[PDB]
Amino acid sequence: MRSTQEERFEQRIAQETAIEPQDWMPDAYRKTLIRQIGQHAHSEIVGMLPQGNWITRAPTLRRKAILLAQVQDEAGHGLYLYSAAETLGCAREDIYQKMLDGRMKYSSIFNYPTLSWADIGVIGWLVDGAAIVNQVALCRTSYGPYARAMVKICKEESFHQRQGFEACMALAQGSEAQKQMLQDAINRFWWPALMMFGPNDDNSPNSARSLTWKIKRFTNDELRQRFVDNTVPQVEMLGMTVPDPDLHFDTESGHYRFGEIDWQEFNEVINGRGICNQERLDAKRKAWEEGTWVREAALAHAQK
């Protein structure tokens, strides 16, 4: 038998009553909200480095400004999510350390390098494209503070996705060289973008409890399919291709059918052995450590 505490909680989730910071929750639920939100916040932070890599090289002042704005927003988004996680009783500083130590994750997509300007536009278009689908889906997540952060965030982020797309359209309507550039970025970011939605429905250990607890409203595979369905026509608009020989439309279901994800690559990535994992964490480690003296100065002045 579930306890009375356990039963009331189940009834609150089922009835869609928002969970608030002062309400009782199961330690595994607390820990799983801390788990997921904390890694969501980290992803906003790490995502600054690949995007930030192209600030000084951005081809026009306008795109450079957009990119700066976008990187600015990510920092702000990290802040909302850290604030939200803290409501669950964790500390911003502690989960950050775990991140730095590799004991917490961040989004797989940021371990991929930006090798061209097109990569910047592709991230804004596809990677944010994938974030939005997932995040809009979380606007009805069972934990109130998280749902409210997602609402706040999706309003602003969809604008920037659009701008990222417009940069892509420019390449698509541009020189031959620009077009080739775009296609390559797509070729390099398509499957990684699909991997942002997580493992298969039968390889996802956190999913069982989360769906039941209505944290995750749609399965990883469900979200991935919606994105593919939505994004293929955007690829078509650009006159571009998807690097997937098995991609084809299925009239019977009304959906796009696509090839198997390289799950072996994905597992490499999450255990720290992708392309930029080491560089990303080193950069973050270096920022923290070399910054120590600034924070200590800051603390001593605060005290005065």
Binding site: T56, R57, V71, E296
Partner: protein
């Protein structure tokens, strides 16, 4: 109109080059809060550069903010030497920033009364932003100089290391003066009293010392730059140079 164009370009270039520098900071700051602040300041500054450069192109009758930023070489660029100084450590960034923010405030407060309407609008916008910059930079100056033993010293050396470039802030040529006599530009020499009153005080409240070395470095306005500028531009202009005359 030629004279006016060069002055406007100077202000843009000051803003452009410094913006570039702040860009390198993205994601490397001691706190997310600083990253945000630095990206915000970089963004503000870039907006101003576009504003200045766009007007310069209209004045010249050709090109645009992009031709100016991407097709000029280091001998044509007219930024202050100060804004092209490397980021160094956070103090170095703060020091450079504080001097510039203080100068911008003195300049733009006064340049918003220009008999040139476009300069006035550009200046009206910039001042509101510059005020934020100075608050942040002075703020950090006080936090570091009156922080720990270690940050106080780093803040002094940073101040020391940048001082010689301060001379350029009040160097006047025949463009400044001619435009100043038409009531259009501000004569940089008359910016001295305000910058010194702010900066000395700012240095003072933070508990630091003003260098006694007489500042002596100028040349940025004449296209005579440090060896720093060249590599900055190689990086900034690369893509445009490889694929010129395109839309992005």
């Amino acid at each position: 109109s030629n004279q006016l164009t060069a002055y406007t370009l100077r202000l843009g270039d000051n803003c452009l080059v410094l913006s570039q520098r702040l860009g390198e900071w993205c994601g490397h700051a001691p706190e997310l809060e600083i990253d945000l602040a630095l990206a915000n300041i970089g963004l503000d500054l870039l907006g101003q550069a576009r504003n200045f450069l766009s007007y310069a192109a209209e004045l010249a009758g050709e090109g645009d903010e992009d031709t100016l930023a991407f097709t000029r070489d280091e001998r044509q660029f007219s930024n202050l030497l100060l804004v092209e100084q490397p980021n160094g450590n956070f103090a170095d960034t703060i020091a450079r920033q504080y001097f510039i923010d203080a100068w911008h405030v003195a300049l733009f407060t006064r340049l918003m009364e220009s008999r040139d309407p476009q300069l006035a609008a550009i200046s009206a916008k910039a001042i509101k932003e510059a005020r934020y910059h100075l608050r942040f930079s002075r703020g950090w100056l006080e936090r570091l100089g009156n922080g720990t033993d270690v940050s106080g010293q780093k803040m002094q050396q940073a101040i020391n290391k940048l001082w010689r470039f301060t001379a350029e802030l009040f160097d006047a040529d025949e463009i400044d003066i001619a435009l100043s006599e038409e009531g259009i530009a501000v004569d940089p020499r008359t910016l001295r009293a305000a910058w010194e009153a702010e900066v000395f005080a700012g240095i003072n409240e933070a508990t630091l010392n003003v260098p006694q070395e007489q500042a002596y470095r100028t040349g940025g306005k004449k296209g005579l730059h440090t060896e720093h500028l060249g590599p900055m531009l190689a990086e900034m202009q690369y893509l445009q140079r490889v694929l010129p005359g395109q839309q992005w």
